[PDB]
């Protein structure tokens, strides 16, 4: 648990971009990568778009779950979500930060998305405290993940359990 440790997890996820070159001094690295030729999309992980966009080589575009409309209806789904809601790729709180950091030289609508993603973030986080104001009787066989994410749950992990076990031992 760190701000970057889970980027050695999460940053491996995939996006799809367009570079500006022909094939490089080497053409392709033996692996799942596809061939490099300007003017067309190519699918990549995310430990390069950092390296690439600021290397002034190419453009970049996001996945589809980054919008306004889908992330304006998912919240009203979440409002009645007595348990959980829709989960676009399940570590989407970090791709947004590493995209909206550099990318906004060309990306559209680079603030209102921040507005809505925090507006979902806070509501689900405050949800993930009220589990605790009902969690009774040492019920360590009954709890919630059903459409939970990861980037929230490290914000609880060292507080509650590390003491909860040796405390609520009595029941």
């Amino acid at each position: 648990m760190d701000p970057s440790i889970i980027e050695f997890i999460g940053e491996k996820c995939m996006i799809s971009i367009i570079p500006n070159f022909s094939n490089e001094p080497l053409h392709l690295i033996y692996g799942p990568v596809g061939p490099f030729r300007a003017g067309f999309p190519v699918f990549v992980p995310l430990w390069m778009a950092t390296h690439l966009r600021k290397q002034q080589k190419c453009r970049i575009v996001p996945p589809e779950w980054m919008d306004m409309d889908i992330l304006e209806e998912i919240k009203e789904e979440e409002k009645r979500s007595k348990f959980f809601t829709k989960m676009p790729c399940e570590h989407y709180m970090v791709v947004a930060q590493l995209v909206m950091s550099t990318a906004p030289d060309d990306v559209p609508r680079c603030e209102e998305l921040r507005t809505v993603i925090k507006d979902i973030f806070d509501i689900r986080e405050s949800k993930l405290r009220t589990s605790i104001d009902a969690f009774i009787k040492g019920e360590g066989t009954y709890a919630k993940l059903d459409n939970l994410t990861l980037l929230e749950i490290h914000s609880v992990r060292p507080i509650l359990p590390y003491s909860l076990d040796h405390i609520a031992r009595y029941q």
Binding site: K79, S81, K82, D122, I123, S126, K127, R129, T130, D133
Partner: peptide, 9 residues
Amino acid sequence: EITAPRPEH
């Protein structure tokens, strides 16, 4: 709105 964890607190 941010008081609301869900409609129950």
